[PDB]
Amino acid sequence: SNAKNYMDKGTSSSTVVKDGKTSSASTPATRPVTGSWKKNQYGTWYKPENATFVNGNQPIVTRIGSPFLNAPVGGNLPAGATIVYDEVCIQAGHIWIGYNAYNGNRVYCPVRTCQGVPPNHIPGVAWGVFK
Question: What angle do CA 106, 40, 2 make, to 5 degrees?
């Protein structure tokens, strides 16, 4: 049925399973169909990409160390904050941007709704300004 879209655990919106057709039938062979995205143990997929996010509309409470909807709290991003991130990750439900604070901790912001699977992510309602 599917080749590699599996992750039997409930991290957030896992076990949705959308893969097959011809994605790993003959195997990636130096060409994964997930694009530039790499997989994380939580089921999250992430790609290195530097872009900017200017927070606005609302102060966004961020998650630290791991992207989930029930992920660790204690990071809150105020509006008017210009965040230059390096990690773009998909935790099914939102797209999360990974950035590091001066404490050396990895903080993730939920930024906008995103559904889908790497590379094609379907955005929804945004709560900030992507730059």
Answer: 155
